[PDB]
């Protein structure tokens, strides 16, 4: 029994999940067990991973283009995954997140931040990640931060349940 397959209602739901390389995004995709990850290379050096099961679709790429903006406009949910143990690159994660949120095509996207790798000893917790990313500053933005360990699965249901509920009841 796959807990994610009935988590997104029955209407079309499109989610874009991005983040710096090594944040844990591909790990999350596999954990959903929603089918084969299809990799496309729309242009050399731009790798896109897609998972689709019935009404739910995840699109994934690393950050850090015209095609990006066409992916944006159809995006209802935006997930930003961050390596909570990588203090050296947390500011870079912030700048990439803020760059995406400045895009008009994502103006109405609901934002879920996965503060990933919470299993590691010296990982910043979700409150610290919230402050380092400046999420309290966000304007006209429906956002949530969820502590996760993608390799164990902890937190993934909780975050996606929050996001799905927001998308289905608004
Ligand atoms: N400790 C820990 N590691 C995690 C967690 N999530 C992902 N990882 C690990 O981090 C590395 C990068 O994950 P990946 O999903 O490839 O990230 P990406 O797709 O965002 O680039 C992988 O290890 P490798 O590259 O070494 O195989 C993966 O196993 C987590 O919650 N905790
Ligand atoms: Mg990857």
**Resolution value in angstroms:** 1.8
Cα of 28 from ligand 1 centre, angstroms: 9
Give the chain's domain count.
Answer: 1
Ligand 1 pocket test, pick from 20, 22, 147 with the greatest ligand atom count within 8 Å of Cβ, gives 22
Domain region containing 16? 1-170
* Contact present, 16 and 138 (Cβ < 8 Å): no
Ligand nearest to the CA of 17: 1
Q: Which atom of ligand 1 is nearest to the CA of 81?
A: 20
**21 Cβ below 6 A of ligand 1:** yes
Q: How was this structure determined?
A: X-ray
């Amino acid at each position: 029994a796959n807990k994610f397959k009935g988590l997104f209602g029955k209407k079309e739901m499109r989610i874009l999940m991005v983040g710096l390389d090594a944040a844990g995004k591909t790990t999350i995709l596999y954990k959903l067990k929603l089918g084969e990850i299809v990799t496309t290379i729309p242009t050399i050096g731009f790798n896109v991973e897609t998972v689709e099961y019935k009404n739910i679709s995840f699109t994934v790429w690393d950050v850090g283009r015209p095609l990006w903006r066409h992916y944006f406009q159809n995006t209802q949910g935006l997930i930003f995954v961050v390596d909570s143990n990588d203090r050296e690159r947390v500011n870079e994660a912030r700048e990439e997140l803020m760059r995406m949120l400045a895009e008009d095509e994502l103006r109405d996207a609901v934002l879920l931040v996965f503060a990933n790798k919470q299993d590691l000893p010296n990982a910043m917790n979700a409150a610290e990640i919230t402050d380092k990313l400046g999420l309290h500053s966000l304007r006209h933005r429906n956002w949530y931060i969820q502590a996760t360990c993608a390799t164990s699965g902890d937190g993934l249901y909780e975050g996606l349940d929050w996001l799905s509920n927001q998308l289905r009841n608004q």
